[PDB]
Amino acid sequence: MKFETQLIHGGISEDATTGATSVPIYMASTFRQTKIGQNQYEYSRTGNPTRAAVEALIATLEHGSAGFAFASGSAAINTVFSLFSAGDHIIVGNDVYGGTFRLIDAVLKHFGMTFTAVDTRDLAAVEAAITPTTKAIYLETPTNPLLHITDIAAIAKLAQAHDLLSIIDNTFASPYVQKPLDLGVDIVLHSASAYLGGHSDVIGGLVVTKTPALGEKIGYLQNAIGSILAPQESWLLQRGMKTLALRMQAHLNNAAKIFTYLKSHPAVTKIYYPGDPDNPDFSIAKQQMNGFGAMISFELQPGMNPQTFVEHLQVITLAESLGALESLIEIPALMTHGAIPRTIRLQNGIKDELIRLSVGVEASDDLLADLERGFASIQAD
Amino acid sequence: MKFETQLIHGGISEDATTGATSVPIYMASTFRQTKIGQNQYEYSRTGNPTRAAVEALIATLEHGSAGFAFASGSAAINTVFSLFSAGDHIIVGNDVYGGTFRLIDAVLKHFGMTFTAVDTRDLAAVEAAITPTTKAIYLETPTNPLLHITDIAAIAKLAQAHDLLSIIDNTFASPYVQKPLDLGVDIVLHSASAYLGGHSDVIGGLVVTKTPALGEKIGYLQNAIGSILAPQESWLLQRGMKTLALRMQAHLNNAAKIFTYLKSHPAVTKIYYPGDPDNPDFSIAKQQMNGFGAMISFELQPGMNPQTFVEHLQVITLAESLGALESLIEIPALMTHGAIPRTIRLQNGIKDELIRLSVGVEASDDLLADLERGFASIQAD
Amino acid sequence: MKFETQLIHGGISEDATTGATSVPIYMASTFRQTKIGQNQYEYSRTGNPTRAAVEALIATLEHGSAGFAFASGSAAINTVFSLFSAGDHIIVGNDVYGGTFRLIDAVLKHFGMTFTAVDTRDLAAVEAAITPTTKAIYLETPTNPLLHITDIAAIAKLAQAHDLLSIIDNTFASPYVQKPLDLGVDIVLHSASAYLGGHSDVIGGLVVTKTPALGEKIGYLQNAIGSILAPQESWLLQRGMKTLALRMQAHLNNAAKIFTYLKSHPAVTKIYYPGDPDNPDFSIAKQQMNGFGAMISFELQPGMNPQTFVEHLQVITLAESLGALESLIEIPALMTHGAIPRTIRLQNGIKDELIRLSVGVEASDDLLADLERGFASIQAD
Amino acid sequence: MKFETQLIHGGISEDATTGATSVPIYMASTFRQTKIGQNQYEYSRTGNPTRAAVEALIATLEHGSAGFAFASGSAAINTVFSLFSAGDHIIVGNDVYGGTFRLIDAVLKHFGMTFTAVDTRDLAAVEAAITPTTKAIYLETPTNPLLHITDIAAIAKLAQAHDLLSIIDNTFASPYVQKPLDLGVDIVLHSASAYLGGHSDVIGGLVVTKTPALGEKIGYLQNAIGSILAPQESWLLQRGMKTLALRMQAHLNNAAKIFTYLKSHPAVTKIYYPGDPDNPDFSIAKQQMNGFGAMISFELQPGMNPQTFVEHLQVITLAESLGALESLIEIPALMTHGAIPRTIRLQNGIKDELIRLSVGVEASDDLLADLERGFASIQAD
Ligand SMILES: Cc1ncc(COP(=O)(O)O)c(/C=N/[C@@H](CO)C(=O)O)c1O
Ligand SMILES: Cc1ncc(COP(=O)(O)O)c(/C=N/[C@@H](CO)C(=O)O)c1O
Ligand SMILES: Cc1ncc(COP(=O)(O)O)c(/C=N/[C@@H](CO)C(=O)O)c1O
Ligand SMILES: Cc1ncc(COP(=O)(O)O)c(/C=N/[C@@H](CO)C(=O)O)c1O
């Protein structure tokens, strides 16, 4: 079936017993067994029909064999790194979500894991960073918040040639835009809190593995650590995923128009956007991404107050998060990336004045009218 | 106010703005800020009114400074142990939940943490286990499934004398029965999937710390690892907790009667129960526990089949989990503790014939009649 | 099985397919049919597993044939009265909930139904009100808010002798106190928003009938009018219902003490309470009720301001509704019964000075202490 | 703001106090009052923040003054008809949903209301039916299931000239397609179970009045009869509504392709579709509808078994209901319209073999392949 049909009917989308057109929400913590060990479900944390349903869906969408739903994107990441042990070495991208930087520095390094940050746009630099004790490569593409694009297929071949896990954080793209397991990657994960839920009303994470052997290891850690996605939220997450494609098209059309409009403003000095033809990422972006994503970051002229700008928007919402129906806007350095020290932020290209815009699905004319309220307030229209 | 009043009115139990006699379920993933950094709430994972309310309530019930709600009891444990680093040594009780055994051996030991199992009923053995790298003592009391009682106040003073964190799993008792923070312990935690929820319909974990400094450390890990309790399920947990005292009184009266009845039966060779006066635990049980719990384990004569016994009950339910309104029953070696290898199980007192019974709140007469069906099926009435 | 056991296991309390210890929440609106006319469920309004479970349970608890769940007690009453046609005449008790009065006067009378209000304590006056076009007798017992007791068995015999439907609103008592169908009544109904839900967090109605024929007519109207209880709230209602006996014991015990205490206060001139032995209803109360309920109304000395009294309570909550874990208090003339005109209020016994107290399950000591802050604020303790 | 922007941000879409980007779910049945009569909310049936939010939203979308949410479409209709009295006469269309027919015949006629069914496409017949006791005109447009289009503006002018209420069931269109209040109508109502919820997972109804005087009457009846939409489902409805415009566009695009495809199949003898240019309703549809709807009904050649056809579809689901993300199909005479007697069905144009297809948003190639499987099974490809 085609992708839009899989959103509506893929995974488990029905209750086989009743024919119900929605997967029932199994709040039950436990399950009566008639003879020990022959039940399909035993304990809600270990598995239950509602969570299994959204888990089957994301596996279908990402073209993986197994999916796993977690209480948050961060918990999904924490579980995946629980594959590694003291003395393992990991290669990480140098533009990541501030919370992933926090997990690495404040938790995983205490467990004896060691990390080297690399610009994964430079595959020479990636291969140079590989050591005999290296075990995996972890990167987001496009990145949070600079939207750097990494050649996934190239990273995956590099990874295969050295017996490394390749791990792609696919949050920003979504399986509608990018299916990294189709490019050789071992593990893909999402913060479902963004596009996959899409309604600004659910926190969760998703992991999909290509092979069943790696699925058995993730599933074992999922049950062992217990950072599971609750049944109500699993159900809400699936419901929102059903409109993923319809939402994404609106998202992407609106972003294309926002980019063009942002470039028509002299108040804007720099724009980060995978669809910029001047951007040297642009060719690998058009090859591996179905569209250019709905994130855009930009700087204003050095005299211009970003706080003043974002605080004078009226449709666009000043908030953390992204991928919601409503446009969200943020200053990474004061908000989602405050967890990264300022000196490190600035070495890796996150200026204190950078603005991150998650383009919603509102009417584009209303969005542009709103953005000009922001330019007007810094004398820049 | 008194405990029962606190269940209904404590923590946050009301919406201040409207007067709503229930805390609203905040499904929102994010919050509009009017200025950056002035919001009370910024991102659902970091905090939201709904999860905050149940966190406040368990903190009041346990007489602590701060509460923290997690996707499950296992996720609470995993977060607590992320306080520690590679090379840290931890003393654990030798009778723990099978999954806590699982997490320690399969995950925590890969992070460079080391562990020594000890009968925490023998305080000299505990002190003998303390090494220069030791960082904490972790134990359940009563234990799962043998219901061994440990002198909490003694363990705390031992831990304080050597700069250790004392961590008590209070799942089997609940704050109605046992308030470890009142006996000097540093951290108390729960699988909320038992008595606190009480209705067999929610998976969750709760952690309470005495001091605000330890609270800031748990809170930071909770946000950084992200195994939060979702909003809907936090609300459901708080709702169940409101009837904790009424449920607990009923649980406890049925368990008293179940204990008397199981001793009148010659088919039962051994009974594990804190209210047993033949138990050497009995004196400490009576001193630190308000009631003897509603868990009971027992063995049948070596001829008799426990699998047959449990499969012939019709009110008591054969399943995992405990602490629900419905009586639950289980064979640990085939179920909740099959994650511990057989050699270590029998070395530590868990025979394969052992039956664990979670005494519910049904009419006691309907419960004894049901147990008589199981005895009759192995010719032993 | 005994009542407490039925609460936990009666009606439908588990999912037969998986063994889930909770009935799953079927959010689906519709159900795939394989062959037309062969599905168990077709459309969620007509029926679904979640609502069916709570309907089955209340039917067990009330000793009836069929249960029906509505969006509120008002909607339940509206559907029951849709049994009747223009020209039909109904005898009603003269102390009914203000909203039942409003339905009758504002809606049902426009449908050509006619009504005589009668003190159903006086059976001779009930018989004198029976007319050639009379079809039914409808009353609450105990009444809202004067807690008048009517002889249920006698009213049924009277109704049977003239081919009338007898309808008892059982909200204040609950099946724990009073099972009207056991006394010959044709239809029993509840505002489940009170004791049955128990947690101040669900709006709902319930109807149970004795015979299947009357059940077919109520069910037909339920589906035709469509005032159904949604699945989420059906599941929440059933979960509340499981603790009904535990909660009721507590409610009843506190209300006993509250009554004793309110008689010791000279500021209280009059007390309405079915457990009052100076009450002429007391004997029939003791014969048809299992406990005297947990409502109490009372008046202060004419100088004393009831608004002052209730506004100075700190544990008792000033609000509408009743039957919650937490104590609620209210002034009917100003609140739940302001829908009745003041002249009709006074002729039927509801003074503007009247205070109605819904006794919760807080510790009785904290409740008596709270009540004396009320008395203190009008200089009367 | 534009329609697509109002979906995301109109009505009440935020929590004012916390800035939550989703309206909180107020499960509370009641609200503490500080001084009597000064609360914004007093009782959840009478109103609560969550239901108020979706009520504001639908009022904005339909360009009306006030919105009202009910437990189902049928309950919304039942409440609107409680505006009328015994002796009142109502004019109805002759093609209505089977349940509206049932409500009229089995309930409202018992209340002394009288009805005359009329082809509302024939304005002369409408005028001919107006009597001195007539008070309203009620019709769906498009109708269920023949999709008959009525000139709404003309019907409103007719009703204005005789001081009648015009009531339009707008379920099949959705406010994205059709806004009857902009054409002079007094009341618009929906079964929100269709396109508004959009996800096959909510039952509810909506009513919107143009004037505030009519709003006060509807609101008074809503509270008095109590057929409210519960808080959980109110919130789900609103979340579904947020994607209404994105879903509708996909709906309508698929329906145009399905219509073309069905017209090229000789097995199809008659098609009912508002966008058929040979349909005499085409011009009025083009003029008053923003698109032709996503419903299609059709008949096959007299030899061909419609049951065989629909039972061989694999993406299209045989089930009641409509307006869902997934395609639904149905045979009205055996299903949604079985409540109308067969003789009356055939008099008014519903043949026993009519098929009613609710076009979903699956990929159109997958839908066309699926329809082929149905035609193949009747030897008609
Ligand atoms: C690329 C990526 N991976 C993982 C996560 C973490 O996932 P949860 O938020 O725990 O669900 C995030 C979160 N980022 C949001 C929230 O701060 C934001 O930047 O605004 C992310 O952007
Ligand atoms: C003393 C203790 N601590 C932690 C946990 C782990 O808590 P979650 O299940 O993750 O909520 C449990 C679980 N025990 C149940 C579950 O199988 C059981 O044994 O039947 C426990 O008993
Ligand atoms: C004896 C009785 N029957 C029916 C109803 C109507 O029940 P819903 O509220 O529609 O569920 C009520 C409600 N009374 C509450 C609420 O005002 C109260 O008096 O405080 C009632 O007390
Ligand atoms: C034009 C119209 N108005 C009102 C209703 C009644 O609305 P609820 O179902 O009570 O929400 C319906 C329902 N019809 C659906 C379900 O049978 C169907 O035909 O498949 C309707 O189609």
Numbering used by the authors:
A (entry chain D), B (entry chain C), C (entry chain B), D (entry chain A): 1 to 381
Text from the published report:
Similarly, l-serine was also found as part of the external aldimine formed with PLP. In this case, a phosphate ion contained in the precipitant solution was found at the site for the binding to the distal carboxyl group of cystathionine. The α-carboxylate of the l-serine makes a strong interaction with the CGL enzyme, like that in cystathionine. In addition, the side-chain hydroxyl group may form a hydrogen bond with the side chain of Y97A (the distance is 3.1 ± 0.1 Å), although the electron density of the group is weak. In the crystal structure of the L. plantarum CGL complexed with l-serine as an analog of l-cysteine, the dihedral angle formed among carboxyl carbon, Cα, Cβ, and Oγ atoms in the PLP-bound l-serine is − 36° ± 17°, which seemed to be suitable for the β-lyase reaction. The conformation is likely caused by the hydrogen-bonding interaction between the Oγ atom and the hydroxyl group in the Y97A residue (3.1 ± 0.1 Å). The l-cysteine molecule is expected to be bound in a manner similar to l-serine, where the bound l-cysteine molecules undergo the β-lyase reaction to generate H2S. In addition, the side chain of the Glu320A residue is close to the Cγ and Sδ atoms of the bound cystathionine (4.2 ± 0.2 and 3.5 ± 0.3 Å, respectively) or the Oγ atom of the bound l-serine (4.1 ± 0.1 Å).
